[PDB]
Amino acid sequence: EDESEALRQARKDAELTASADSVRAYLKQIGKVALLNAEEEVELAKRIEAGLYATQLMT
Amino acid sequence: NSVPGAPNRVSFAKLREPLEVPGLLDVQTDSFEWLIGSPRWRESAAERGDVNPVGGLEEVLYELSPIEDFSGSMSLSFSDPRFDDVKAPVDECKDKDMTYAAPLFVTAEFINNNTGEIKSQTVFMGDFPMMTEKGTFIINGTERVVVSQLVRSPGVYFDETIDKSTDKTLHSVKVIPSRGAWLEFDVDKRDTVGVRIDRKRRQPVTVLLKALGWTSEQIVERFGFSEIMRSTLEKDNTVGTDEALLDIYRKLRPGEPPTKESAQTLLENLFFKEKRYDLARVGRYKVNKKLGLHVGEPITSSTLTEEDVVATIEYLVRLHEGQTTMTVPGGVEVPVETDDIDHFGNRRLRTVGELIQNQIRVGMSRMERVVRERMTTQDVEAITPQTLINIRPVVAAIKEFFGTSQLSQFMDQNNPLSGLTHKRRLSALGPGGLSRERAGLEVRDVHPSHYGRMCPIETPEGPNIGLIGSLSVYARVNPFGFIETPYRKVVDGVVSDEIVYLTADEEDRHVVAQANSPIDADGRFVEPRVLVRRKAGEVEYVPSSEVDYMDVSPRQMVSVATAMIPFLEHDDANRALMGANMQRQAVPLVRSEAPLVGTGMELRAAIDAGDVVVAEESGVIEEVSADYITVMHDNGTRRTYRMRKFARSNHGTCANQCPIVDAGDRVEAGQVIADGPCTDDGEMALGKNLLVAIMPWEGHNYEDAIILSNRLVEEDVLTSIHIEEHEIDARDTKLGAEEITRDIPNISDEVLADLDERGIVRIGAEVRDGDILVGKVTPKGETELTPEERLLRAIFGEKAREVRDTSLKVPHGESGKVIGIRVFSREDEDELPAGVNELVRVYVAQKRKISDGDKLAGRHGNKGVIGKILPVEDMPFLADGTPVDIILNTHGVPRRMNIGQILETHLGWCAHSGWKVDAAKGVPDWAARLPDELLEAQPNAIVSTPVFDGAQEAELQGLLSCTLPNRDGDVLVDADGKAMLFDGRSGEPFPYPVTVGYMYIMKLHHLVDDKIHARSTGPYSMITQQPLGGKAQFGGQRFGEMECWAMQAYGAAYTLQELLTIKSDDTVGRVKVYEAIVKGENIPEPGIPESFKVLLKELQSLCLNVEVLSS
Amino acid sequence: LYRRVINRNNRLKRLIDLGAPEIIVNNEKRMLQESVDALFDNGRRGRP
């Protein structure tokens, strides 16, 4: 079913495929990062604000 | 007969035909009627499948609707496809180059399931091209004809194969549905099976049946007798429905991790969903017949079902066991056998309806995509069907289909027969078909099912041999796409008049009889053994009581182009093939005399070709003129047929129409009123009746050459009016405007005499190669004015002449008088293309006489060019003194096996001189079966001969015996056909008699005037400096590598280098050679070809360091 | 084909100079490789 080595390495092997079509390979790779919500967006925006502030301070 | 104006054509036919030939255009008209859904077709299906009367457009609209959004609370549907009157009648759309078309209207229902509101908007679908009465479309003025296509009908196809290793038999299947993914079930080299899904070579049936919600108990219950599938299920090695689903996901959608539900829905969306796998309505019924699934149920759910898959498994596995009959649980029993792919029960025919349906389906798919995109981006209740609809893709798709598609081609019309045969022709190349390179040897062969459906003789001799053919004369297209032919059914040796129609597959389960059988009028064949066609196409003897079908008539297996060949049965198949093909390319002469010896098919072929005026309604003729005929019908009103005079055909021939009625005659509905280009008294006439001697004369008729007398040239017996058109357009340009004016720079006056001040040639003025036609002057802009030009103008006072005279001139090698000028312009408020503002087209015609090199041929396969036209003195003449017109060689007819035309020659002489059979002491033995009214024939009497039931040898010999003379007492020909004839060169009589008689010859459209070409220094191509090729361009013959082989073998090196470098390529070499030969100087040393430098640069651009080293 | 090569090369230059995550840079380099592939021999690898 899903556990007991039937589906985990199944997913790993299915993902680890040749993907001859270039668009297919790109869509396979893009299916790796989870989507984001508003709180994550504002938190990452705060992190980027801190990063650019630190870059300005370095300058 | 049965034609009101039919000339009296006596016939040698023995038996009668129970039915007349159907309207040979019925495969184009009826299909378009189905497409539109006209009331004629509406009532046609009322007794031929009224279970679901629906048109092609109605079917597509119903399939498309309803279309909704992701939420399902808002949707749109289509209904009521209503047409409209055509914008303009045919001739004007042929004049100003507009498509013969009418607006299309449909009703759109907007539904909003959230609250519910109705919006019935009558949207303008577009401009749908229509089909004319002749079955030809008009696109941009041109007349185009679409042809039906032969493809493999979607369904199930089992087949057998030998491994050639241990001689084990293997059985494979290919369920090939349109717009879907293939499944290939077979028995592998080893014992197990192969279940290839969409080209993936793994996973025997174990995972598939398991993936259908089953488990091992079901597959072991269904299959306990099939040890092959028992071994396979034992070799499952997988337990678990989800395990099988993920294993399928491996080899159906790799690259994405599988989940519990993804594979289960993926299988349904791949096979059992009618959006990604929909075998057409033909495919579902083909599967049902092949498997006996449903035998009395309406057609619905075009998508493939699971019981279909299980029945396919059972059928295949039982076939591997060698079983004969399979009975599916829940269905009738079906015999188990391999399916042939060329049998006409598996090859359908996509007529015009199906092709236009497919293009409309693509257009509606784009429509559904765009409307699905748009229905969500706009807020509810602010959206209307008009803004949901953007009709652009539909008209784009129809324009894509009608133009720049190889299945809807330019009409081949240089005589009525070519037009008739271009339609009702079956092709096999194109979208969904097989290319000639893709075509094997098996497909080109004649299948036993071709009989009565597709003619086995009519097919082009070129590379396309066998790929494209012509429809039979009695053939019918079922409302289902399969082809079908009529046949009378005999019961217990009693022949019935009831005509029933059978397809290719329905013929196997019956036994059809011979066409010309010894019928006694009581239905009983006098001998028990009769030639019959068995199930597998085998011919054999069989007693009479068990046969159940017979051919409706002879010439049922043959088309309309081959049914016009007299004495067909006496000719080899190859020569009959070529004769049928040359019948298509005869030219329309200026008189078109009817043939003496022919077949009854000529009248019907001429009548229904559509180019002869036929009185639709009976009545007296009010008045007759060359331009028009006014006919007064019985019910007061009148009708004026406007005759078409001197119209250029698509191949530049003549299409005059001469009325053949008087000012006070009565004409019945259906009678021929006026004759077309190649018709006499409403019957086909593609040639002339010429007296023939078959002796080989002094080598001028050597190797198929033909010699003619000057009488044909002087009496205009073989001369054709040929018309060409020359378009030329003045268009806007950054330099300004190009003017159609007489202000033509640096021209004389003797060549300006025949132009009007408007700037074009006077109507009725003679031109020739090089003469100016239209004076169009373009602003030259600027260039390097040579100093020598300045000294030139300083010597004479010539103006700069600031404009370039790129006027239109008659191209090389033609002449003749001008027929008409048509001019269009923007200030004439015309629909000119955006960019051009004048467009003038001039028609020039010349009465092309017959000369050396013109190809003349009979309709029996004999061909040849005119070796010479020698004067009337030097012609062998009979004792009466009439010179022979055409002499052909005798060394071709016995070797090439076309003796039929010798019989035609003798029958023609009998028909010309007239005959009478002495019925004093009873009728002679040979004339006992000869019909009455054929024992007497006046001079120049026309006869007829059906192709397979015609005049026999004994009857023709008896006719030759009594051949009463015309004016003097002189039986020129003896009983054996030969006749004495006097030499016109030396004067003494020839030692031995030779055969003479009247033969029907035709001039082919391969005249030498359009076939002679030569050039000294013309233009050259861009990339490589080689001269171009063709007749439109100045050309230049291709000196290929095969001729390079010959020149190298000769040992001639200087000639080869000359032909390569300076004569073709070396630019400086070309100009230097021309200067040297003009200057009378020695031709210089050839240089280096430019194409080699082009190759060197090209190879360098491919990252290949190529340098040529001096040392 | 030359226009495709030029476009891909210029976009890769922009990506490198601007500074982008390595996935987009790898995708652009793959597109450049496939574009040169199409230029030298169309249809040899993959659909033409």
mmCIF file of N, CA, C and O in Angstrom, chain B residues 452-498:
data_model
loop_
_atom_site.group_PDB
_atom_site.id
_atom_site.type_symbol
_atom_site.label_atom_id
_atom_site.label_comp_id
_atom_site.label_asym_id
_atom_site.label_seq_id
_atom_site.Cartn_x
_atom_site.Cartn_y
_atom_site.Cartn_z
ATOM 1 N N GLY B 452 -16.731 -4.335 -57.126
ATOM 2 C CA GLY B 452 -17.964 -3.597 -56.977
ATOM 3 C C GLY B 452 -17.863 -2.325 -56.169
ATOM 4 O O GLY B 452 -18.734 -1.458 -56.297
ATOM 5 N N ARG B 453 -16.837 -2.184 -55.332
ATOM 6 C CA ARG B 453 -16.669 -0.988 -54.515
ATOM 7 C C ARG B 453 -15.721 0.010 -55.174
ATOM 8 O O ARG B 453 -16.104 1.149 -55.457
ATOM 9 N N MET B 454 -14.485 -0.409 -55.429
ATOM 10 C CA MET B 454 -13.459 0.445 -56.009
ATOM 11 C C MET B 454 -12.923 -0.209 -57.271
ATOM 12 O O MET B 454 -12.617 -1.405 -57.278
ATOM 13 N N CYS B 455 -12.819 0.576 -58.337
ATOM 14 C CA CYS B 455 -12.395 0.031 -59.617
ATOM 15 C C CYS B 455 -10.955 -0.466 -59.532
ATOM 16 O O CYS B 455 -10.085 0.234 -59.005
ATOM 17 N N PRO B 456 -10.671 -1.664 -60.039
ATOM 18 C CA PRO B 456 -9.305 -2.192 -60.009
ATOM 19 C C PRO B 456 -8.433 -1.762 -61.177
ATOM 20 O O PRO B 456 -7.262 -2.156 -61.223
ATOM 21 N N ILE B 457 -8.960 -0.974 -62.109
ATOM 22 C CA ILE B 457 -8.225 -0.559 -63.293
ATOM 23 C C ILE B 457 -7.804 0.903 -63.213
ATOM 24 O O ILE B 457 -6.663 1.239 -63.531
ATOM 25 N N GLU B 458 -8.709 1.784 -62.797
ATOM 26 C CA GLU B 458 -8.441 3.221 -62.791
ATOM 27 C C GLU B 458 -7.539 3.557 -61.611
ATOM 28 O O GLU B 458 -7.972 3.546 -60.457
ATOM 29 N N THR B 459 -6.271 3.861 -61.905
ATOM 30 C CA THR B 459 -5.296 4.301 -60.916
ATOM 31 C C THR B 459 -4.111 4.879 -61.670
ATOM 32 O O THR B 459 -3.762 4.351 -62.735
ATOM 33 N N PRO B 460 -3.496 5.956 -61.187
ATOM 34 C CA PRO B 460 -2.398 6.568 -61.943
ATOM 35 C C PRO B 460 -1.184 5.658 -62.017
ATOM 36 O O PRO B 460 -0.938 4.832 -61.135
ATOM 37 N N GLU B 461 -0.423 5.816 -63.099
ATOM 38 C CA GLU B 461 0.735 4.978 -63.374
ATOM 39 C C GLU B 461 1.988 5.419 -62.631
ATOM 40 O O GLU B 461 2.959 4.657 -62.586
ATOM 41 N N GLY B 462 1.995 6.618 -62.056
ATOM 42 C CA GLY B 462 3.172 7.144 -61.408
ATOM 43 C C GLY B 462 3.459 6.475 -60.079
ATOM 44 O O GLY B 462 3.040 5.344 -59.820
ATOM 45 N N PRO B 463 4.203 7.166 -59.215
ATOM 46 C CA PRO B 463 4.487 6.607 -57.884
ATOM 47 C C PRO B 463 3.235 6.307 -57.078
ATOM 48 O O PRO B 463 3.258 5.418 -56.217
ATOM 49 N N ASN B 464 2.140 7.019 -57.334
ATOM 50 C CA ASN B 464 0.900 6.854 -56.591
ATOM 51 C C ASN B 464 0.072 5.669 -57.067
ATOM 52 O O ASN B 464 -1.130 5.625 -56.781
ATOM 53 N N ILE B 465 0.672 4.722 -57.788
ATOM 54 C CA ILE B 465 -0.085 3.589 -58.310
ATOM 55 C C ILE B 465 -0.685 2.809 -57.150
ATOM 56 O O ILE B 465 -0.001 2.489 -56.171
ATOM 57 N N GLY B 466 -1.982 2.520 -57.244
ATOM 58 C CA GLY B 466 -2.685 1.784 -56.220
ATOM 59 C C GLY B 466 -3.046 2.576 -54.985
ATOM 60 O O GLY B 466 -4.002 2.209 -54.293
ATOM 61 N N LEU B 467 -2.315 3.647 -54.678
ATOM 62 C CA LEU B 467 -2.629 4.435 -53.492
ATOM 63 C C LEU B 467 -3.968 5.145 -53.640
ATOM 64 O O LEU B 467 -4.787 5.144 -52.715
ATOM 65 N N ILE B 468 -4.213 5.750 -54.798
ATOM 66 C CA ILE B 468 -5.454 6.466 -55.064
ATOM 67 C C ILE B 468 -6.173 5.784 -56.218
ATOM 68 O O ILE B 468 -5.545 5.385 -57.207
ATOM 69 N N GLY B 469 -7.482 5.613 -56.071
ATOM 70 C CA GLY B 469 -8.291 5.008 -57.107
ATOM 71 C C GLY B 469 -9.582 5.767 -57.323
ATOM 72 O O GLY B 469 -9.733 6.889 -56.836
ATOM 73 N N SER B 470 -10.521 5.167 -58.043
ATOM 74 C CA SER B 470 -11.795 5.801 -58.338
ATOM 75 C C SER B 470 -12.940 4.909 -57.886
ATOM 76 O O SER B 470 -12.827 3.680 -57.876
ATOM 77 N N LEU B 471 -14.044 5.545 -57.509
ATOM 78 C CA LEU B 471 -15.226 4.821 -57.075
ATOM 79 C C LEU B 471 -15.824 4.026 -58.231
ATOM 80 O O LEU B 471 -15.654 4.359 -59.405
ATOM 81 N N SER B 472 -16.538 2.961 -57.880
ATOM 82 C CA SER B 472 -17.229 2.166 -58.880
ATOM 83 C C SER B 472 -18.402 2.959 -59.453
ATOM 84 O O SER B 472 -18.686 4.090 -59.049
ATOM 85 N N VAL B 473 -19.096 2.353 -60.411
ATOM 86 C CA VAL B 473 -20.232 3.024 -61.027
ATOM 87 C C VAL B 473 -21.516 2.806 -60.229
ATOM 88 O O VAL B 473 -22.384 3.684 -60.203
ATOM 89 N N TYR B 474 -21.650 1.664 -59.559
ATOM 90 C CA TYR B 474 -22.821 1.355 -58.754
ATOM 91 C C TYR B 474 -22.571 1.518 -57.263
ATOM 92 O O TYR B 474 -23.478 1.265 -56.468
ATOM 93 N N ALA B 475 -21.373 1.938 -56.871
ATOM 94 C CA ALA B 475 -21.003 1.943 -55.463
ATOM 95 C C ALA B 475 -21.808 2.973 -54.684
ATOM 96 O O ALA B 475 -22.209 4.010 -55.214
ATOM 97 N N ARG B 476 -22.036 2.674 -53.411
ATOM 98 C CA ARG B 476 -22.761 3.534 -52.492
ATOM 99 C C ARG B 476 -21.968 3.666 -51.201
ATOM 100 O O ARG B 476 -21.263 2.744 -50.783
ATOM 101 N N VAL B 477 -22.087 4.826 -50.564
ATOM 102 C CA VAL B 477 -21.460 5.076 -49.275
ATOM 103 C C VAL B 477 -22.536 4.963 -48.207
ATOM 104 O O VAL B 477 -23.528 5.702 -48.232
ATOM 105 N N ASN B 478 -22.348 4.033 -47.278
ATOM 106 C CA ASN B 478 -23.301 3.865 -46.204
ATOM 107 C C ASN B 478 -23.311 5.111 -45.328
ATOM 108 O O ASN B 478 -22.334 5.860 -45.287
ATOM 109 N N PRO B 479 -24.407 5.353 -44.611
ATOM 110 C CA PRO B 479 -24.450 6.516 -43.714
ATOM 111 C C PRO B 479 -23.448 6.398 -42.578
ATOM 112 O O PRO B 479 -23.383 7.256 -41.692
ATOM 113 N N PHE B 480 -22.662 5.328 -42.607
ATOM 114 C CA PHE B 480 -21.761 4.971 -41.528
ATOM 115 C C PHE B 480 -20.297 5.119 -41.923
ATOM 116 O O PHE B 480 -19.416 4.945 -41.076
ATOM 117 N N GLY B 481 -20.019 5.474 -43.174
ATOM 118 C CA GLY B 481 -18.671 5.642 -43.674
ATOM 119 C C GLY B 481 -18.134 4.444 -44.422
ATOM 120 O O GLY B 481 -17.199 4.597 -45.219
ATOM 121 N N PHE B 482 -18.698 3.262 -44.200
ATOM 122 C CA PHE B 482 -18.295 2.089 -44.954
ATOM 123 C C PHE B 482 -18.881 2.137 -46.357
ATOM 124 O O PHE B 482 -19.935 2.732 -46.595
ATOM 125 N N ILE B 483 -18.189 1.510 -47.282
ATOM 126 C CA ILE B 483 -18.599 1.481 -48.679
ATOM 127 C C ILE B 483 -19.524 0.290 -48.880
ATOM 128 O O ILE B 483 -19.489 -0.682 -48.120
ATOM 129 N N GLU B 484 -20.361 0.356 -49.912
ATOM 130 C CA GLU B 484 -21.454 -0.590 -50.057
ATOM 131 C C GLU B 484 -21.904 -0.633 -51.511
ATOM 132 O O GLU B 484 -21.923 0.395 -52.189
ATOM 133 N N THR B 485 -22.255 -1.826 -51.983
ATOM 134 C CA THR B 485 -22.630 -2.045 -53.371
ATOM 135 C C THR B 485 -23.933 -2.825 -53.447
ATOM 136 O O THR B 485 -24.220 -3.645 -52.570
ATOM 137 N N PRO B 486 -24.746 -2.589 -54.474
ATOM 138 C CA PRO B 486 -26.002 -3.329 -54.615
ATOM 139 C C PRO B 486 -25.798 -4.694 -55.256
ATOM 140 O O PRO B 486 -24.829 -4.938 -55.977
ATOM 141 N N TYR B 487 -26.746 -5.588 -54.980
ATOM 142 C CA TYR B 487 -26.715 -6.921 -55.562
ATOM 143 C C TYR B 487 -28.103 -7.537 -55.466
ATOM 144 O O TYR B 487 -28.770 -7.411 -54.437
ATOM 145 N N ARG B 488 -28.533 -8.188 -56.543
ATOM 146 C CA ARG B 488 -29.798 -8.907 -56.526
ATOM 147 C C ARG B 488 -29.657 -10.210 -55.752
ATOM 148 O O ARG B 488 -28.622 -10.879 -55.800
ATOM 149 N N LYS B 489 -30.715 -10.575 -55.036
ATOM 150 C CA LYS B 489 -30.726 -11.772 -54.207
ATOM 151 C C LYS B 489 -31.559 -12.847 -54.889
ATOM 152 O O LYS B 489 -32.738 -12.630 -55.188
ATOM 153 N N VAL B 490 -30.946 -13.994 -55.131
ATOM 154 C CA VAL B 490 -31.619 -15.136 -55.737
ATOM 155 C C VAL B 490 -32.032 -16.096 -54.632
ATOM 156 O O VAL B 490 -31.275 -16.340 -53.686
ATOM 157 N N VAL B 491 -33.238 -16.646 -54.747
ATOM 158 C CA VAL B 491 -33.782 -17.572 -53.761
ATOM 159 C C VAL B 491 -34.165 -18.861 -54.471
ATOM 160 O O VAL B 491 -34.904 -18.830 -55.461
ATOM 161 N N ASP B 492 -33.650 -19.988 -53.966
ATOM 162 C CA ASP B 492 -33.918 -21.328 -54.507
ATOM 163 C C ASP B 492 -33.853 -21.350 -56.034
ATOM 164 O O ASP B 492 -34.626 -22.036 -56.705
ATOM 165 N N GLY B 493 -32.897 -20.614 -56.586
ATOM 166 C CA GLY B 493 -32.811 -20.480 -58.028
ATOM 167 C C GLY B 493 -33.951 -19.693 -58.634
ATOM 168 O O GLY B 493 -34.450 -20.058 -59.705
ATOM 169 N N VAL B 494 -34.390 -18.628 -57.967
ATOM 170 C CA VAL B 494 -35.358 -17.689 -58.524
ATOM 171 C C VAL B 494 -34.781 -16.297 -58.303
ATOM 172 O O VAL B 494 -34.522 -15.904 -57.160
ATOM 173 N N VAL B 495 -34.566 -15.562 -59.387
ATOM 174 C CA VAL B 495 -33.918 -14.258 -59.309
ATOM 175 C C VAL B 495 -34.972 -13.194 -59.044
ATOM 176 O O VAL B 495 -35.967 -13.093 -59.768
ATOM 177 N N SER B 496 -34.752 -12.398 -58.006
ATOM 178 C CA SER B 496 -35.681 -11.356 -57.607
ATOM 179 C C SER B 496 -35.230 -10.001 -58.136
ATOM 180 O O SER B 496 -34.044 -9.761 -58.378
ATOM 181 N N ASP B 497 -36.204 -9.113 -58.322
ATOM 182 C CA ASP B 497 -35.920 -7.735 -58.696
ATOM 183 C C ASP B 497 -35.515 -6.901 -57.485
ATOM 184 O O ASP B 497 -34.893 -5.848 -57.651
ATOM 185 N N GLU B 498 -35.807 -7.370 -56.274
ATOM 186 C CA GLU B 498 -35.472 -6.620 -55.071
ATOM 187 C C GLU B 498 -33.963 -6.433 -54.972
ATOM 188 O O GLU B 498 -33.207 -7.409 -54.951
#
